[PDB]
């Protein structure tokens, strides 16, 4: 596309600059360009891709929630008729959000996942696939919602199976995957007990493996473990 | 209050 | 343009929704559409236009400063050569910023200012003209900079002349104009003494008129007076 | 530290 004429290394360099400038739309466009060069991504590059799109979709999700809340209040009894504008604008934001999710899922399918053979890369991409289907699920309604939910579940499950076989219980990718899958269970799949069980077992198995880690790795793992703990406190 | 997911770095 | 098919009232309604959702690019596009309907703007609508573009250009200015700082460090002695990418990306952001400023100045010239006859509207628009020329001046270099600086000065001066004749010293528009013109003097025009004198006299003349105001108007005026005071403390 | 300008409302 528009980044076809720019060197891979220049795209990565500019993605890092965009991050520093908090220009996340630009960062995402640069990283999309880098992916489309067709080479596999390094660990650092994978994280740049994730940071970029997470921030973009994050703003869209926050906006969608604001607009959805206003729309829901408009349909209460006693609320005055204000015309189609709230629905229209919520739909506009929703369509843009779905577009970003579709873009990410497209990159994963063409061809990041199929070329990812190492556990660290494959789990990372399958987790991302689950996350972006989860974001689609947040705004979906009806039967389409069922299929989207199943797609998220399937991606997370494949990632979980690999992570349990190939990574230690303290591995930050494994921990972040378990965290997000537990959120899926609680917030999307109407399965709070599964969410709680997953978070608890993940936390406890990580706790038992902390003794193997360096100071720096200990910091990395315990940061994510704290998020599991925070959710468990909210949920119980 | 919403559940917290991970934050990329 | 793209908003040509949407009702004026619907554009205003959606601008307010966009503000609530912190979607300032959308807010600006809606307000541009509203202006282009060709009717004059109410006080509330003028404030929506200002809020929208202030937030858009604000993000661009913050990004530009980050990138300019990196670029300046790259040209220090001992700094390793990293290629054209920093300059290129700074130029990209700069061009987008200049585009937004040009859009605002275009709306003011076609035809907001010429149709504005009341002091409140005319001063508001002339202040905006000064502000957006000031933002252009921040990124300008050389002789072009001189002309841009003069354009900012001229707009602010016309606004000041009207405000002094037609508005009380505590009027929030008058106060905000004096504040921004003082910033122009200090940050753009290399005239710190003029900045200090303007801020001091503005503050003192407002102080002396506070006794005429309601509780609510007193709050409005004193908020802006505090900004004058904050700058004076920084500058002296 | 930069000078503060007004904030629209
Ligand atoms: Ca090449
Ligand atoms: Ca009623
Ligand atoms: Ca309406
Ligand atoms: Ca829809
Ligand atoms: Ca139970
Ligand atoms: Ca402990
Ligand atoms: Ca609790
Ligand atoms: Ca009409
Ligand atoms: Ca060197
Ligand atoms: Ca380079
Ligand atoms: Ca330039
Ligand atoms: Ca002096
Ligand atoms: Ca006092
Ligand atoms: Ca001082
Ligand atoms: Cl819309
Ligand atoms: Cl660029």
Numbering used by the authors:
A (entry chain A), C (entry chain A): -4 to 231
B (entry chain P), D (entry chain P): 290 to 298
Sentences from the paper on this structure:
Among the numerous protein families facilitating PPIs, the family of 14-3-3 proteins stands out due to their ubiquity and high conservation across isoforms. These ‘central hub’ proteins hold a key role in cellular signaling networks, as they are known to interact with over 1200 protein clients, and are involved in pathways related to metabolism, apoptosis, cell signaling and tumor development. Protein interaction with 14-3-3 can yield a multitude of effects,8e.g., the structural stabilization of the client protein, the masking of functional sequences, or bringing two proteins together. In this work, we developed and validated a deep learning approach for predicting putative protein–protein interaction sites between 14-3-3 proteins and phosphorylated client proteins.
Our model was applied to identify novel putative binding sites on biologically relevant 14-3-3 client proteins (FOXO3, Myc, BAD, Notch-4, CFTR and p53). The model was used to screen 296 potential binding sites and to select eight peptide sequences for follow-up assays. Experimental validation confirmed the predictive power of our model, with three out of eight newly predicted phosphopeptides exhibiting low-micromolar binding affinities to 14-3-3, two weak binders and two binders with marginal affinity. Structural characterization via X-ray crystallography further substantiated our findings, revealing binding modes consistent with known 14-3-3-client interactions. The identification of such structurally representative 14-3-3 binding motifs, without having provided such structural information to our models, testifies to the strength of our deep learning approach.
